[PDB]
Design a protein around this motif. Sequence first.
Motif, PDB file in Angstrom:
ATOM      1  N   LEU A  12      -8.839   9.807  -6.844  1.00 53.81           N
ATOM      2  CA  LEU A  12      -8.271   8.477  -6.651  1.00 53.81           C
ATOM      3  C   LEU A  12      -6.824   8.563  -6.184  1.00 53.81           C
ATOM      4  O   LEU A  12      -6.411   7.822  -5.284  1.00 53.81           O
ATOM      5  N   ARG A  13      -6.039   9.465  -6.776  1.00 52.70           N
ATOM      6  CA  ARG A  13      -4.657   9.638  -6.344  1.00 52.70           C
ATOM      7  C   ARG A  13      -4.598  10.056  -4.881  1.00 52.70           C
ATOM      8  O   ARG A  13      -3.921   9.420  -4.066  1.00 52.70           O
ATOM      9  N   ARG A  14      -5.312  11.127  -4.527  1.00 54.62           N
ATOM     10  CA  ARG A  14      -5.346  11.568  -3.138  1.00 54.62           C
ATOM     11  C   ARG A  14      -5.867  10.473  -2.218  1.00 54.62           C
ATOM     12  O   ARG A  14      -5.431  10.371  -1.066  1.00 54.62           O
ATOM     13  N   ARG A  15      -6.791   9.645  -2.706  1.00 51.97           N
ATOM     14  CA  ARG A  15      -7.319   8.546  -1.903  1.00 51.97           C
ATOM     15  C   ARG A  15      -6.206   7.591  -1.482  1.00 51.97           C
ATOM     16  O   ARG A  15      -5.980   7.364  -0.287  1.00 51.97           O
ATOM     17  N   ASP A  16      -5.499   7.016  -2.459  1.00 50.51           N
ATOM     18  CA  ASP A  16      -4.427   6.073  -2.153  1.00 50.51           C
ATOM     19  C   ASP A  16      -3.370   6.699  -1.253  1.00 50.51           C
ATOM     20  O   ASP A  16      -2.713   5.993  -0.477  1.00 50.51           O
ATOM     21  N   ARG A  17      -3.191   8.018  -1.339  1.00 49.04           N
ATOM     22  CA  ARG A  17      -2.164   8.688  -0.550  1.00 49.04           C
ATOM     23  C   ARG A  17      -2.498   8.651   0.936  1.00 49.04           C
ATOM     24  O   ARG A  17      -1.612   8.444   1.773  1.00 49.04           O
ATOM     25  N   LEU A  18      -3.773   8.846   1.284  1.00 47.90           N
ATOM     26  CA  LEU A  18      -4.181   8.837   2.684  1.00 47.90           C
ATOM     27  C   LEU A  18      -4.410   7.426   3.204  1.00 47.90           C
ATOM     28  O   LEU A  18      -4.190   7.163   4.392  1.00 47.90           O
ATOM     29  N   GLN A  19      -4.846   6.511   2.340  1.00 41.55           N
ATOM     30  CA  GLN A  19      -5.296   5.191   2.765  1.00 41.55           C
ATOM     31  C   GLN A  19      -4.217   4.121   2.641  1.00 41.55           C
ATOM     32  O   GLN A  19      -3.892   3.464   3.631  1.00 41.55           O
ATOM     33  N   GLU A  24       1.131   1.319   4.321  1.00 46.43           N
ATOM     34  CA  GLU A  24       1.780   0.150   3.738  1.00 46.43           C
ATOM     35  C   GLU A  24       3.086  -0.178   4.452  1.00 46.43           C
ATOM     36  O   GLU A  24       3.357  -1.347   4.753  1.00 46.43           O
ATOM     37  N   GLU A  25       3.903   0.837   4.737  1.00 50.26           N
ATOM     38  CA  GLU A  25       5.216   0.580   5.322  1.00 50.26           C
ATOM     39  C   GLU A  25       5.104   0.168   6.784  1.00 50.26           C
ATOM     40  O   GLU A  25       5.837  -0.717   7.240  1.00 50.26           O
ATOM     41  N   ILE A  26       4.198   0.794   7.536  1.00 49.90           N
ATOM     42  CA  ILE A  26       4.112   0.525   8.970  1.00 49.90           C
ATOM     43  C   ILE A  26       3.458  -0.828   9.231  1.00 49.90           C
ATOM     44  O   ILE A  26       3.845  -1.546  10.162  1.00 49.90           O
TER      45      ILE A  26
ATOM     46  N   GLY B  11      -6.501  -0.309  -5.265  1.00 51.07           N
ATOM     47  CA  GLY B  11      -6.901   0.429  -4.078  1.00 51.07           C
ATOM     48  C   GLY B  11      -6.985  -0.485  -2.866  1.00 51.07           C
ATOM     49  O   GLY B  11      -7.444  -1.624  -2.950  1.00 51.07           O
ATOM     50  N   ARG B  12      -6.531   0.033  -1.726  1.00 49.53           N
ATOM     51  CA  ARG B  12      -6.484  -0.737  -0.495  1.00 49.53           C
ATOM     52  C   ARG B  12      -7.164   0.021   0.634  1.00 49.53           C
ATOM     53  O   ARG B  12      -7.363   1.236   0.575  1.00 49.53           O
ATOM     54  N   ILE B  13      -7.511  -0.735   1.677  1.00 47.97           N
ATOM     55  CA  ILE B  13      -8.117  -0.197   2.881  1.00 47.97           C
ATOM     56  C   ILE B  13      -7.306  -0.712   4.067  1.00 47.97           C
ATOM     57  O   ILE B  13      -7.216  -1.929   4.262  1.00 47.97           O
ATOM     58  N   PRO B  14      -6.694   0.151   4.871  1.00 44.07           N
ATOM     59  CA  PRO B  14      -6.072  -0.329   6.113  1.00 44.07           C
ATOM     60  C   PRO B  14      -7.136  -0.852   7.064  1.00 44.07           C
ATOM     61  O   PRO B  14      -8.125  -0.170   7.349  1.00 44.07           O
ATOM     62  N   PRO B  29      -3.750  -7.195  17.875  1.00 40.12           N
ATOM     63  CA  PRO B  29      -4.470  -6.923  16.624  1.00 40.12           C
ATOM     64  C   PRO B  29      -3.708  -7.362  15.383  1.00 40.12           C
ATOM     65  O   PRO B  29      -2.478  -7.473  15.402  1.00 40.12           O
ATOM     66  N   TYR B  30      -4.437  -7.614  14.299  1.00 46.68           N
ATOM     67  CA  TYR B  30      -3.854  -7.980  13.016  1.00 46.68           C
ATOM     68  C   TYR B  30      -4.128  -6.860  12.025  1.00 46.68           C
ATOM     69  O   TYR B  30      -5.288  -6.519  11.772  1.00 46.68           O
ATOM     70  N   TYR B  31      -3.064  -6.296  11.466  1.00 48.68           N
ATOM     71  CA  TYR B  31      -3.173  -5.214  10.501  1.00 48.68           C
ATOM     72  C   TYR B  31      -2.997  -5.777   9.100  1.00 48.68           C
ATOM     73  O   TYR B  31      -2.083  -6.573   8.854  1.00 48.68           O
ATOM     74  N   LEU B  32      -3.875  -5.367   8.190  1.00 46.18           N
ATOM     75  CA  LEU B  32      -3.913  -5.936   6.855  1.00 46.18           C
ATOM     76  C   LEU B  32      -4.491  -4.909   5.895  1.00 46.18           C
ATOM     77  O   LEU B  32      -5.449  -4.209   6.232  1.00 46.18           O
TER      78      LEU B  32
END
Lengths: 38, 255
Positions: A12-19, A24-26, B11-14, B29-32
């Motif tokens: 789960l930790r590694r998951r959030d790190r890649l996903q 989030e910032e970009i 948990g999130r999904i780009p 495009p819309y990024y969320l």
Amino acid sequence: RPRWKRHISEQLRRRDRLQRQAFEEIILQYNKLLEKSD
Amino acid sequence: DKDVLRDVWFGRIPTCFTLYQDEITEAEPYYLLLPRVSYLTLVTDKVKKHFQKVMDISEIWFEYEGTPLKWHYPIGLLFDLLASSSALPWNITVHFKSFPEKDLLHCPSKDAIEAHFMSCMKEADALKHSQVINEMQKKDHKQLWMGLQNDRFDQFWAINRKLMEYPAFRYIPFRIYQTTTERPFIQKLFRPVAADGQLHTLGDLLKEVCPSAIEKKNQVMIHGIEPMLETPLQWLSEHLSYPDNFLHISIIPQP
């Protein structure tokens, strides 16, 4: 503590790190330009 | 293990919402970031706000690789079952016309989701519980939804712990989704404890329900991870269950 318990917390930790943290910032910057440019 | 509960909830999904080529209009495009635990309905409004500037009518439906997405499935499962293999972000193509009759009706109405979402809980409780949801007031029911809708972990889980405690579960709410199977998913009865009281295992569940997982090596994915099969089945139902008290388990191929 158990191996299988730890594995899931690692995965789960590694998951959030890649996903999430990866994008989030970009994604927030991009949306601000989109609205600032409209 | 409050640590696992928070990691799963946040948990999130780009996701990259692109507008179809035929749609009338310069659209960008819309990024969320999508909450894996939520549903596409809740995030749909922001997609409507962005692309509405460029438009026609707002009867929206999303497709991935040409297969429309189901409003009733959690965002987490959909990505896991369809997009986990491909690279990020989740490339969704937004449509506003050519609405399909095979897909669900127009984006469900806020309560229609709350209704569907609570139906999954009352059903879930019936498999694990006597009854508990019948005990708690209709005052608490709005707390479970508001907690999910507003993504308030504390507000949601304060009530949800009662749904996860069992006196010193009768059955484990689960739905096994297969990419290439005639049925939509596989749901059946399964107990967390054997005739000898031993804890049941994820492998035991598949062995009894979905034995076809074990040429064409499959992948058992939950919440975007491959949890080794030794995992006790109860602890999953208590922690790795989606907010609707259900364990959505994906059987995926491999590269």
